[PDB]
Amino acid sequence: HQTHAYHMVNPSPWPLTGALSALLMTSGLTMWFHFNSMTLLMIGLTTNMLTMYQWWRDVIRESTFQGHHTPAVQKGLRYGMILFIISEVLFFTGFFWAFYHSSLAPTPELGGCWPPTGIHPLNPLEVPLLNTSVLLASGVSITWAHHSLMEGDRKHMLQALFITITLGVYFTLLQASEYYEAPFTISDGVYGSTFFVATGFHGLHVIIGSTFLIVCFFRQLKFHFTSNHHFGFEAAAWYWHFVDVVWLFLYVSIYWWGS
Amino acid sequence: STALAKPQMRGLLARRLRFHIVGAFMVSLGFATFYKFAVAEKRKKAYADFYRNYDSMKDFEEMRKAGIFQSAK
Amino acid sequence: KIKNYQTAPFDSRFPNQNQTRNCWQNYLDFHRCEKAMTAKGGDVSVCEWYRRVYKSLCPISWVSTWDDRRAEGTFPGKI
Amino acid sequence: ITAKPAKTPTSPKEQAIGLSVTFLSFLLPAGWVLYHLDNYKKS
Amino acid sequence: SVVKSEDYALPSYVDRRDYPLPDVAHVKNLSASQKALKEKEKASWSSLSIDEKVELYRLKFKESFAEMNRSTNEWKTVVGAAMFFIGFTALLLIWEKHYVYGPIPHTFEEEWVAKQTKRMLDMKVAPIQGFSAKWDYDKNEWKK
Amino acid sequence: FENRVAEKQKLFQEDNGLPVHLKGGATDNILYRVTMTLCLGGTLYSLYCLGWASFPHK
Amino acid sequence: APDFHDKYGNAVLASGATFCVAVWVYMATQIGIEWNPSPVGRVTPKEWR
Amino acid sequence: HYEEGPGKNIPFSVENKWRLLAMMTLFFGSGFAAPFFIVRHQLLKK
Amino acid sequence: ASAAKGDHGGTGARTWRFLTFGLALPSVALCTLNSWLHSGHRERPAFIPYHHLRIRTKPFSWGDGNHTFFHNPRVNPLPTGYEK
Amino acid sequence: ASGGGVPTDEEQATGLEREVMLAARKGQDPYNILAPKATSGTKEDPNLVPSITNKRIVGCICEEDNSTVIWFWLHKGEAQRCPSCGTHYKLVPH
Amino acid sequence: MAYPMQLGFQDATSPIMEELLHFHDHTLMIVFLISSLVLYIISLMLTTKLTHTSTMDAQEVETIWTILPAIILILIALPSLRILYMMDEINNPSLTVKTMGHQWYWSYEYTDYEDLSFDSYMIPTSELKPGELRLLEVDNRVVLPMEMTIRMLVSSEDVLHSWAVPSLGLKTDAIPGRLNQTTLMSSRPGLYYGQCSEICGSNHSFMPIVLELVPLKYFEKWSASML
Amino acid sequence: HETDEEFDARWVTYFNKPDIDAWELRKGMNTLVGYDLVPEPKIIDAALRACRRLNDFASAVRILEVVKDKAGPHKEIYPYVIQELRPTLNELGISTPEELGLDKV
Amino acid sequence: MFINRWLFSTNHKDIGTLYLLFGAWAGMVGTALSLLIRAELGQPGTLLGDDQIYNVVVTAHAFVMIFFMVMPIMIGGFGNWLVPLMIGAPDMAFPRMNNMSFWLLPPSFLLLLASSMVEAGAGTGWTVYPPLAGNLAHAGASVDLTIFSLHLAGVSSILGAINFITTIINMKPPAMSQYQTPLFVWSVMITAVLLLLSLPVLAAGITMLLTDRNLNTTFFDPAGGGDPILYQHLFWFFGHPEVYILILPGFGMISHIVTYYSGKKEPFGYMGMVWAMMSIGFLGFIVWAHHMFTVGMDVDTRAYFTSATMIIAIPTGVKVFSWLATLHGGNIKWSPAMMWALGFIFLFTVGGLTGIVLANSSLDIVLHDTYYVVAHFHYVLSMGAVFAIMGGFVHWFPLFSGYTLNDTWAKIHFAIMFVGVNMTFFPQHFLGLSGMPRRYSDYPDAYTMWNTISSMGSFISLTAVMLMVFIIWEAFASKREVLTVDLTTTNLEWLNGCPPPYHTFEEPTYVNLK
Ligand SMILES: CCCCCCCCCCCCCCCCCC(=O)OCC(COC(=O)CCCCCCCCCCCCCCCCC)OC(=O)CCCCCCCCCCCCCCCCC
Ligand code: HEA
Ligand SMILES: CCCCC/C=C\C/C=C/C/C=C\C/C=C\CCCC(=O)O[C@H](COC(=O)CCCCCCCCCCCCCCCCC)COP(=O)(O)OCCN
Ligand SMILES: CCCCCC/C=C\CCCCCCCCCC(=O)O[C@H](COC(=O)CCCCCCCCCCCCCCC)COP(=O)(O)OC[C@@H](O)CO
Ligand SMILES: CCCCCCCCCCO[C@@H]1O[C@H](CO)[C@@H](O[C@H]2O[C@H](CO)[C@@H](O)[C@H](O)[C@H]2O)[C@H](O)[C@H]1O
Ligand code: CUA
Ligand SMILES: [Cu+2]
Ligand SMILES: [Mg+2]
Ligand code: NA
Ligand code: NA
Ligand SMILES: [Zn+2]
């Protein structure tokens, strides 16, 4: 028997299934891009979802059900999440770098101007402003959710978290609509390239963040969270704030300053 | 017989170090010049001596007559 | 005036290794000048300098591509 | 470090075998490929 | 004497010139005569014989300083074997030259090199120090 | 909803030697088998795809 | 008791050195390797044009 | 639990030195051989 | 800045709910209204076959290889112009 | 405006998390979350090292801010001393 | 060009290359000083039976280990940056020449007056004339006036290449959509060789550069004849 | 940082403690040989008498060996130290490593 | 049981062992590729008769040595084995995610090998610059498989970096501050911070290349207003921290080895060593454009990158002189690991000094993309990393295995390797100074002599590698079991015996605060 507070994890198949899912998704994208076929990719996506589901299921089992999350284990997970978020910030930094590189020194092929000749940018005061109010509002409602949880208030936690998720969905649907309405495309030179890749990765993170919030919502429904122990919720909240802040930088840089 | 005299017994390592670091330095400063005198100054003099009375047109003429050029027969 | 033209002179607007914009600017200047002069029924030959400079600096393929695109109506610079 | 005498001693003869087998495992396949390089081009 | 794997956590014996007095005696268990010797050691050491003094030393320690610090002939084996394998490498290089490599380009033929050498001198390759500087253009020969 | 955490705590703390990924019961075993079969089968298929793609169809 | 090095050290050293020198000298000089050394003081320049 | 101790904390057997030799030969040998066979493969493609 | 609001006595759930319903959601409602007026079709841009736009270096891995993923017939011309 | 429905740690914490929580309430540290405070470390006043077995590794930071830690097995029986500073440690099993 | 068994730089063809040679001598002297000092000290540490294994105080000696290297770096940086800024000074060229990299050959454009352009390909080994250099000769050399400041403009019409002539101290990457500028001035007539210096595919090894430096009058007649 | 004399006096006092135990004897010698010095005869004398109070002849011989070892290539140091210690060696009946043949490889 | 233990591991030792096996196998692949390189160059003319294949071999050589040999061995192998033991931790913070970092690597390696088997391979250089790496000059799957291989390796190391940072910050004894952790632990921490920040930038860059190749983006394509030079910035923004990533755990092991075989309880100037690694890690983020001195950058930018790059010599010098000061007064044990460490110190110094030569942008104009750069990094990186790895391997082999190596054989191996690597790489300085470009399958005739010698050298190192395998076989064949190890008081990783039990520190160490 151990006399430290750390978690020795049962031998697990999910790292291997996760790694194999990565092989399948990447070889699958290769197959899709070059050999006109989607089979490998679909299998990879499926095994990836299965891996994530069972892995995080087990983390819930280990914590809520088995009590392995001592304060020391929880503290480790805090560092882990913070460090993951930092890595995601640097990933976006590479796309912001690409945006500023292209837009600050527009080449002659673009007309030597930004936005390029033939590009008609979206009005940042229209749906992009709406998007901004939506994610900012969702940062307020998620903070309400956190305080309700800490104060032991089940109903208001659920209501605030539901509002936050609804806003996440609203942003996602607004963005999908704006993608369809946009008169420029990903193939419209470096303007389209930077716009859609940067906002597209952001949109993906909004979807991931929303999903994580939905997971917390159902765990809350099932009474998993105590008023003091709820790291899955914290963290979905940190990740959500991260997604808000990335949006603000996108809005200021690409939509506003780059228009 | 006679007794043996008392030798130095303390800081033998530090005393060895003190002695040899000066030698480590003196190689360097003594050497410094070897690359300097034998390579660097030699090079400066070679370039100076080469160009002092260098006649580029004469050099060209010799090259031209040797048949090396596409543009000059 | 400045005939005896040897090559494009140093231009303090473009003092660095990347000379792309120098070529570009002079190309634009020449064709803008030609258009302005023709609009006013004037002497195009006052524009000659910009032509000499861009001819000196610009790769032949760039000039050729730009000329094709002006004729096509797809030149992205303002003239 | 100190250690026990070998539980299963590897004699000079056994070492020669292990060494030779090891060297051949690297040399023979690569040697085969390199020897036949001209055959791969002329095919 | 006999050190066991399962004893790893216990203070152990070592012979090390920078740790002269190790944590345990070399020999822990004592025979009847060895016990009597340790008793004798409690009286004046002048009454101990040289043999008894050596035996007491050998109970406490394994090797002496002179023993543990002795030089060896290992360098001969190391340097000799290294040279053997470096020599073996040349056999692989001979094999490679014979069986893998074909002819090198015609430009290395003696007459080519002579003509190319003249052309390099004609174009004054490295005329300050490197190449043509070593040719005497007046005497039509390599400088001495 | 009723708070049933205590029931889950009892189930997952049962002294049955099962690893956490199978401790929910028979459904864990099925889902595990489906996942590993898709991964291993998919990996074999990726290798086949590599073999196919490694050779020209001029 | 004499160890491996006491018994065989001298022989390993002598044979190793002799073998190494011989095979490298042979490889370097006898199998047609073209080292392409400097022409300086070696090659007589020849009319090319 | 698992076997612990020398020769037991590894995914390969060292119970027989000759079987081990064969396995290490195949293991390091396959890695060393692979680039030569990749080159051969590419040359044979045209 | 202190915004212009000014609450602080204890940062609790009640305050954050007050902000959610009193500031955050009303801002969304306002922006939603604002968008619901500047909606409607902005005229489609006249087609010019600019070489820096409608890039095709490799066919897309869907459809006929020539349509972008969220292709909108109304406003996204192909390299050859707007669809018939 | 505000009801309950969220369980507390007191009600719902289980397994090792609960043990740590209950022991902390008693001012006890069976899972080694806290650094023990040193005694004077004499033979009369040795540092008391709890263990669930008959030996435990001690690390001794001989002087404040030493970067070097001195490590050794402390065995059941008479007090042992740090081989660097000589401060005394004694195993108290359990 | 390089010659067999060469150890150092090709002889300088331009004053800037001469500067680089002396600066390299200076730096390599320092490099030799440090590497030998380290080797000497290491051997010293390892050649005594005398021991001292108790804690050693670090701060006094670390001052020396930081300050002296800092001083040495300044002694390298000072002449290093002098040459950098001299390389960059305004010099007023008499001529502009463009070069475009291609897979796998160089083209040259001299368009100050007339439209002169041509391609420059490696002479295949089987076609070398007696005495010519394997992998280095081209069919059409870059003829240029000696003793004159020339502006070279470098770009590419496909992948990256890099236009280099070591004996002039030149290497300028050739990047599509970009026009990189360098200056060229030869103190001497002759033939000066270089090789593509950015990996550009399967014939990267086989697209060399040959400059032919001759008097202006010869350059002018060659230019005219190349139209 | 204290004189040579104060350093030596401290060490003399260390080994002179009447009821010095085996652990303290080992700790002392093992610490002392870490320093950049060969210990003065008076330190060694005190350490040898501690060996006597601890009824440990072998450690006395070992202490003499480590004196020789700490001197390194300075071959004059050990014969001098032995010289200075001879009355103590004679008084306590301590044989040197050489007299015991323990200097043989 | 086999599958549970070796495929489903949550144990830092076993996962460490997996990484060491993977890295060793990769080392054989990378070595074979290096020999093919030197075979092509071993005489003038063409050996392979296919320079696309040559370029593919060069490219794969680099990726294999960096991503599959060095990083897995140092961080995955020694990091996993040693870090938890050195801080008395029962395992890594995330022992299951740790296992995925490992298992991502065989698929990553499979993608790289697939890239080389399909079409004509990725003959791009390990830099993968567009437009050469674009969909016109490299049409088809090869470059995309290379990008995906890098994605997987990237994810593996990013998650590993999160694991190491968390473990090192969170899982020390409560009394142990960060200034009481051994230098190797520091070196892994700092390396992990560099990975965490740098790899996502690379991921962004290669993703943009992937979309240029497949989704008609034009990040790097001037036709759409893109810029090939943007890719270079993104790549080298990762790529310089990466070279420090490759050496840092090496500095850490070197500090332990030198301390140990000097018979010291501690390295000289511990806080200076910590300071030096952190300074190097920091400065490593602000120098990347020294890889781009010939792309056409402004003069002031060149002056800045020259100056910032040279400054790194200062903290690096502190480490070199502190190793020397660690040796000073040591009871020197001439073990094979000590020889590797001593070889490391001198070869690293040589390569670092040629780095200082290259930092000078004016000189780099003439040296960029020549064999002088190849010589620089095979000293500082290739020899530095390999010698630190071999030192660490010989030193800790008895800990990991419970068996001893034959020290004489190991000394013979070091000797052959030392001769081989210097014969191979030293003459490449002359080739670079005299103007021979890198990434060439053939050279003007003047360069023959040094290329011939260099290729002969490469065969000497081949003999050493073959011998290394035999030596490991001989250890496992003979089964000499470890008894006692010296200096356990200052080398905690040995204190649980050899090999340590599956579970160590189930009861944590006792450390009081005083
Ligand atoms: C391998 C073939 C060598 C061929 C040498 C040709 C002989 C010179 C011609 C005889 C002279 C004939 C006249 C021709 C002069 C041309 C000089 C010139 O125009 O141009 C300048 C030259 C000048 O350089 C030389 O002059 C080469 C000398 C080598 C430096 C010392 C290294 C040790 C010797 C090398 C052999 C061992 C190889 C193992 C490598 C060891 C790693 C350094 O080119 C360089 O810049 C070389 C680049 C080296 C930079 C790395 C720093 C190395 C530091 C190590 C110090 C080790 C301490 C020794 C102690 C060493 C003990 C370990
Ligand atoms: C282990 C990996 C490693 C390390 C540690 C380094 C260390 C350094 N490197 Fe290197 N380098 C690479 C691996 C590494 N390098 C690789 C792989 C490439 C090319 C990649 C490619 O193109 O494929 C490269 C390329 C590279 C270039 C680009 C050259 C070009 O492509 O044109 C430059 C230029 O500045 C550079 C400089 C430096 C410097 C200044 C250091 C310094 O950190 C070194 C500092 C150390 C010392 C200086 C020695 C010790 C110090 C003393 C004894 C103190 C006293 C000394 C002085 C006062 C000078 N390196
Ligand atoms: C509502 C916003 C949410 C986005 C959800 C939409 C689906 C795409 C997936 C999102 C992931 C984002 C990044 C992938 C890059 C491209 C997609 C960018 C977002 C997007 O969806 O852009 C669309 C194009 O999508 C396209 O090409 C479709 C191409 C789809 C395949 C993507 C290729 C896979 C890329 C590999 C990712 C690498 C990940 C690296 C991980 C780092 C490891 C360290 C825009 O449509 P359009 O018709 O051109 O213009 C509008 C005209 N009316
Ligand atoms: C189109 C979509 C396809 C892309 C695939 C991605 C899909 C979406 C994934 C959404 C993320 C869901 C994560 C759910 C994790 C649930 C498990 C959990 O939250 O576990 C918690 C621990 O936190 C923890 O591990 C924290 C674990 C944090 C996980 C981090 C989540 C981010 C993952 C992003 C992955 C891809 C991003 C990169 C894309 C480029 C458990 O501890 P507590 O909550 O304190 O409970 C204990 C109390 O009950 C005791 O009283
Ligand atoms: C960079 C890596 C360096 C590798 C160095 C390799 C050193 C040599 C190892 C021996 O390799 C063998 O050599 C034989 C020739 O000596 C080949 O037989 C070939 O030649 C024989 C004689 O001509 C015939 O009997 C065989 O059929 C024919 O396969 C054989 O295939 C090959 O395995
Ligand atoms: Cu063109 Cu390399
Ligand atoms: Cu760098
Ligand atoms: Mg380059
Ligand atoms: Na909280
Ligand atoms: Na070749
Ligand atoms: Zn202590």
Residue numbers in the entry:
A (entry chain C): 3 to 261
B (entry chain I): 1 to 73
C (entry chain H): 7 to 85
D (entry chain M): 1 to 43
E (entry chain D): 4 to 147
F (entry chain J): 1 to 58
G (entry chain K): 6 to 54
H (entry chain L): 2 to 47
Authors' account:
In this study, we determined the structure of a reduced CcO crystal at neutral pH in order to compare the structural alterations that occur upon redox change at neutral pH and pH 5.7. The structure of reduced bovine CcO crystallized under neutral conditions (pH 7.3) was determined at 1.99 Å resolution. A peroxide anion detected at the dioxygen-reduction centre indicates that the reduced crystal contains oxidized CcO at a ratio of 0.20. The significant structural alterations that occurred following the redox change were restricted to the region around the magnesium-containing water cluster, whereas no other significant difference density was observed in peripheral regions. All water sites in the magnesium-containing water cluster were in almost the same positions as in the reduced state at pH 5.7. Subsequent to our previous studies, we determined the occupancies of water molecules in the magnesium-containing water cluster and found that the total number of water molecules was 20.40; this number is identical within experimental error to that in the oxidized crystal (21.15). Helix X of the oxidized and the reduced states at pH 7.3 superposed well onto those of the corresponding states at pH 5.7. The structures of helix X in the oxidized and reduced states were termed ‘closed’ and ‘open’ structures, respectively, in our previous paper. Interestingly, the B factors of residues 380–383 in the reduced states at both pH values are significantly higher than those of the other regions of helix X. In contrast, the oxidized structures at both pH values exhibit smooth distributions of B factors throughout helix X. These B-factor distributions indicate that residues 380–383 are highly flexible in the reduced state. The structural alterations detected at pH 5.7 to Asp51, the magnesium-containing water cluster, the haems and helix X upon redox change, which provide important structural evidence for the H-pathway proton-pumping mechanism, were reproduced at pH 7.3.
